[PDB]
């Protein structure tokens, strides 16, 4: 909408600059200059809210993602393509990558497992076994994160040249 | 030490059951049924606390590695002693590598990031360099946690012949 919006995307700001734990309806009724009525009225459960929060994060890298359609392409060199989705969903201030991680946190956790889990690697998963087989997509898969980690938990910058090459040695024949 | 030990494992404790936010001197004191003054002899900050307590998971991992001193040797197949570590790390109930996240993640946010971060594929990947190549290495490292990531965001079991073909994929030659 734009009421429930501004509220999803304060407390996507209360989070990544206090984490899990610096997020209420309280908080988040503060960063968002709205009532907590307004805050409650969108969101029950905290869940509901940290929820819509990732599953936000979760639908701006699968936007990324259907940026490119050539990795559906079998003619396009899908070790590139995918060096480039990564280059992106990174290129910035990691933001909604230190979300799903830090989601991923919460998930594993919690029994909120599935949303932040899964939904992230699902499409892709899905799209990457239709492109492939399904050993190499859940290789792919595995990559993309930990290449991801690396790059926050070492802060280090993204070096595409080498993503490139390491996803292209777990693509076969 | 023993007094320090209980203390740390406690905060241990508090955390895979409570998070980041669940432990603090008074909720560590508590279940380790130990004064405060105990609790804060041997640690000052609550980071030395959080510090200490991942740093033991770091040395946890580290005697699943120096358990296979394989690894090293270049006769040995990489890839399956590569997957047996992890086997390893794993079987059980993942205790360790929900820390090393957890930590992961609290480290991600603070400038806290370097002790989880680093210290784990610092030594795993200072050796897979001298084992193969530096390129090659950063790999391993990455599908490693990837590997790890999803083996607990998806609640699934390890899969040991999954991981040595995924594994076998980024080793040369």
Redesign the interface.
Known sequence: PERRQRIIDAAIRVV?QK???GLSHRTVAAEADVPLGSTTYHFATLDDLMVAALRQANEGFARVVAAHPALSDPEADLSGELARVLGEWLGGDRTGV?LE??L??????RPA?RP???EW?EGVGALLAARTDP?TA??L???????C??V????TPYDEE?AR??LT??I?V
Chains 1, 2 share one sequence.
């Not at 991923?104 to 956790?109: E, Q, V």
């Not at 898969?141 to 290449?147: F, K, M, P, R, T």
């Not at 926050?152 to 802060?155: C, E, G, I, K, V």
């Open positions: 990544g984490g899990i734990a230190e991680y830090e991923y946190l919460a998930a594993l956790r497992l932040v889990a899964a690697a050993t859940r290789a898969v595995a990559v993309l994160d930990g290449i980690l690396q926050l938990l070492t802060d080498y090459e390491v040695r777990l076969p």
